[PDB]
Ligand binder design. Structure first.
Ligand SMILES: [Zn+2]
Length: 46
């Protein structure tokens, strides 16, 4: 296998949509931009 991370330790904020973690709240909010904005105003139905 192959997994490289800062090491041990968890985060306070965690995207309750995909399953991602974030140290700073702001950072998290910026990430949601992917769940709130994925496709433009078109025939798409989410
Ligand atoms: Zn997410």
């Amino acid at each position: 296998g192959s997994s490289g991370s800062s090491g041990t330790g968890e985060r306070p904020y965690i995207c309750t949509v995909c399953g991602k973690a974030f140290t700073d709240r702001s950072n998290l909010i910026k990430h949601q931009k992917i769940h709130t904005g994925e496709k433009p105003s078109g025939p798409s139905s989410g």
